[PDB]
Design a binder for these strands. Structure first.
Ligand SMILES: [Cl-]
Ligand SMILES: [Cl-]
Ligand SMILES: [Cl-]
Ligand SMILES: [Mg+2]
Ligand SMILES: [Mg+2]
Ligand SMILES: [Mg+2]
Ligand SMILES: [Mg+2]
Ligand SMILES: [Mg+2]
Ligand SMILES: [Mg+2]
Ligand SMILES: [Mg+2]
Ligand SMILES: [Mg+2]
Ligand SMILES: [Mg+2]
Ligand SMILES: [Mg+2]
Ligand SMILES: [Mg+2]
Ligand SMILES: [Mg+2]
Ligand SMILES: [Mg+2]
Ligand SMILES: [Mg+2]
Ligand SMILES: [Mg+2]
Ligand SMILES: [Mg+2]
Ligand SMILES: [Mg+2]
Ligand SMILES: [Mg+2]
Ligand SMILES: [Mg+2]
Ligand SMILES: [Zn+2]
Lengths: 71, 103, 97, 77, 50
RNA sequence: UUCAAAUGAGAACUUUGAAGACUGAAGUGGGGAAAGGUUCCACGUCAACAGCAGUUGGACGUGGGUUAGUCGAUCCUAAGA
RNA sequence: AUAUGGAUUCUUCACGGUAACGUAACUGAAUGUGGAGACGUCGGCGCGAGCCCUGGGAGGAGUUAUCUUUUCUUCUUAACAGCUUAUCACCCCGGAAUUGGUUUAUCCGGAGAUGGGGUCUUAUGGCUGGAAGAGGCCAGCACCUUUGCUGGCUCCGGUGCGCUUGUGACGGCCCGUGAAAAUCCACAGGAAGGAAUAGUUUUCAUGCCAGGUCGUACUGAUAACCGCAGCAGGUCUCCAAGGUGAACAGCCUCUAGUUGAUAGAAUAAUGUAGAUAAGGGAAGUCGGCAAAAUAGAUCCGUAACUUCGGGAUAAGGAUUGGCUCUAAGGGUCGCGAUCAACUUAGAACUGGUACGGACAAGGGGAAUCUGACUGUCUAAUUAAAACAUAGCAUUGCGAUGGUCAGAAAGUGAUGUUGACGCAAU
């Protein structure tokens, strides 16, 4: 997941099983003050949902990731 | 000598699972799924194929222009010219005969 | 419609293990034209100047044939381990030591 | 995807208010039997389709580059 | 089985998380009698009958 | 089936190279449906299991991995319920 | 969601063509009608695609005592878009016996052939855009390294009872004539709505926004499924190279994949599996059980009997290699030129008389009992003469009915049926 942050400008999140793509996009914009290009989601084999959130070109996923605190 | 596989999860050779082998810009043979061929619209009186009407699947007629789906004449995309000709001749002759039967 | 074929033999010649005169003579007696050898009736001409080998032909000839004859001559003198027939541009070849 | 042949309709595409980029492609191609020539292809990236103008005259290709709008972004090769 | 319903996959997820040995610090508790995981399941021995 | 090297406390069985063979395109090849459910992949590791062996493994321990407006489900009706 | 451009209107809701019909567009409510969705199987023929085969040329590799202008390998083009491309069908002119046209297959013409000129469906193919910037094949340079950089070429053809597959026009067959619905379009109809200082068209072009939810790894089997298991069992389907040959047969090979099944030494008896035998030839045995013999192709020849269709590959004979030649069988162009297929027949020569040289591959005849035939059954001891079958005959019934079902019912099967039917033997 860290490679996508550095290379693909994509942030990877674990999200609620009840949330759809509309809610994930809205939550990311409000929590982090960024813009979202598209969202891809999947259900992991352990029963949790993972979302691939790609930001627009005006934003960098690397500087947002360390602003949150993880690296 | 290069062999191909289905690109969907249907493994059976049904009508909706027909394929055609093509060669890609990458230099390899790959299967291509083709849809079922369309059928020409037929005349409503004699059942013959209509001239000047595009041959498409039913839902594809909603994307093409009206000129593709009609002929500039009465009963354009419904009946052929010969059947329309018989309708006009029959309509005129019978109505004339009705007048002389009245008198 | 005569096509020109040129072979650069400077690299093996400067070492002293290759004889350009012998190579040119070998091509004269082995290029088959319209059948057997010896029918070079003003159709295939091979020249020599000590640094390059130029073959001018109007009859049936190709670069693949030229490489085929060179390899036969190369092994006849036991020189396949050091000399390789390499094409730089179209219809322009060289021997690499 | 769509090839344009008229020079007049090419110039209006470059200022259609929805075009941002264009590219110039130079191909060295041979004629029917003789020496090669320089082929220049002008591609305009529209919102829904890509328009390509192909001209085989080197002299006319130079004039079109000069008349190309400066606002439009041009990619060379 | 590649095309599976959500009910089947959800039960598959639960079985995946239960397929672990006994935590070690459990054996050190006061008055502990649990020695190993008695409900361990392996795909080669007993089927889930799901 | 054979030779050599590497690894290891330990090699007829692990790895690499060389050689000899076979499946011979209705295959011992390349994909799927039903079914199984993590067996997929990496690292660590050999008490038990692989009816010889084992440094190897579909084993053991710990983790990683399944991204769709266009592929399916979803919609339609069939025998029927 | 909506603007612009274009089109249309002061003859309000467009024009052209004799016509088939054509186009960038070129109002259409209720209601009605039609089409598409939408269909069997077999046979030969036409065409397309991929593959196979092959020539020239530009690269790389292998062999080289000798021979081999040689052996192997790379030379590719997606969805989509514009123009164009067709058997069939149709339109106009014209009016046919001295009947013509015409398919491998004999059907068509005064209900208008042949012929001349046109229109149309776009399966399909060609060119161009996509697109060489990709991918593929090589050469020359740096270099522990994050690792690249610069160069060239990627071209033009041929062939077909070939293979796989798609499709078209036809033909054979039935007491069998071989789904439904959602959904989409067209037409008929004319309710309304619209122009002159102005409106309508989102079925013409361009531009704007959004498209949720669940599945998606891997095996698919001599180890991932089911058989107590890592069991020689069982379990649906797609893709399919070269040679030999009629062949998806057997045998050998390329691509790809495996090289796994406890091993070492020795070679007694008895076994299991595979084989050969002098002379005799079923004397063996309940019984020719088992094994042997026959075997492809070409030619010659072929009985009793018969429902005339068969029997029949009846029976019984001859031939088959290699090599060098001969003859016949075509296409395309202006009697010549030129190009390209394996089919058949025949003749010399040659040999340890061998030649369907491995592989592959019918024993046959004279009669009796019995069932007509193809078909079906005792999964795990019986495949038959048993069952079924067409044919034949008998029986019941005209619906307030016959046969049968149900605890009951304002309940059911035959019956989406009607004696050329249904039901019972
Ligand atoms: Cl799964
Ligand atoms: Cl024995
Ligand atoms: Cl009888
Ligand atoms: Mg998904
Ligand atoms: Mg389906
Ligand atoms: Mg074998
Ligand atoms: Mg073999
Ligand atoms: Mg594994
Ligand atoms: Mg063991
Ligand atoms: Mg052991
Ligand atoms: Mg484990
Ligand atoms: Mg997969
Ligand atoms: Mg099992
Ligand atoms: Mg004997
Ligand atoms: Mg006896
Ligand atoms: Mg006796
Ligand atoms: Mg026997
Ligand atoms: Mg019988
Ligand atoms: Mg039969
Ligand atoms: Mg039995
Ligand atoms: Mg039996
Ligand atoms: Mg009987
Ligand atoms: Zn009609």
């Amino acid at each position: 997941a860290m490679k996508k942050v550095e290379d693909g400008n994509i942030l990877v999140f674990q999200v609620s099983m009840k949330a759809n793509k509309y809610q994930i996009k809205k939550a990311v914009k409000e929590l982090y003050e960024v813009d979202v290009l598209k969202v891809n989601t999947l259900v992991r084999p352990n029963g949790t949902k993972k979302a691939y959130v790609r930001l627009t070109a005006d934003y960098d996923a690397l500087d947002i990731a360390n602003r949150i605190g993880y690296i | 000598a290069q062999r191909v596989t289905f690109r969907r999860r249907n493994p059976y050779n049904t009508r909706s699972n027909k394929i055609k082998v093509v060669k890609t810009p990458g230099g390899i043979l790959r299967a291509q799924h083709v849809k079922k061929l369309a059928t020409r619209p037929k005349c409503g009186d004699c059942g013959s194929a209509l001239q000047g009407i595009s041959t498409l699947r039913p839902r594809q007629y909603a994307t093409v222009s009206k000129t593709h789906k009609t002929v500039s004449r009465a009963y354009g995309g419904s009946r052929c010219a010969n059947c329309v000709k018989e309708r006009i001749i029959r309509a005129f002759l019978i109505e004339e005969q009705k007048i002389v039967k009245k008198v | 419609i005569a096509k020109t074929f040129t072979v650069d033999v400077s690299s093996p010649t400067e070492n002293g293990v290759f004889d350009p005169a012998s190579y040119a003579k070998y091509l004269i007696d082995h290029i088959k034209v319209e059948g057997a050898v010896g029918n070079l009736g003003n159709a295939v001409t091979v020249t020599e100047d000590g640094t390059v080998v130029t073959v001018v032909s109007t009859a049936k000839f190709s670069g693949k044939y030229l490489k085929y004859l060179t390899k036969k001559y190369l092994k006849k003198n036991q020189l396949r381990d050091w000399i390789r027939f390499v094409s730089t541009k179209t219809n322009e070849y060289r021997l690499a030591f | 995807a769509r090839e344009i042949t008229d020079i007049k309709q090419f110039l209006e595409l470059t200022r259609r208010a929805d075009v941002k980029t264009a590219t110039v492609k130079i191909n060295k191609k041979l004629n029917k039997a003789g020496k090669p020539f320089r082929q220049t292809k002008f591609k305009v990236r529209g919102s829904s389709s890509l328009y390509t103008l192909v001209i085989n005259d080197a002299g006319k290709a130079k004039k079109l580059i000069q008349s190309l709008p400066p606002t439009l972004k041009v990619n060379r090769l | 089985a590649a095309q599976k319903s959500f009910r089947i996959k959800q039960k598959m997820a639960k079985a995946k998380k239960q397929n672990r040995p006994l935590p070690q610090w459990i054996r050190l508790r006061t008055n502990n009698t649990i020695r190993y995981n008695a409900k361990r399941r392996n795909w080669r021995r007993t089927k889930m009958n799901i």
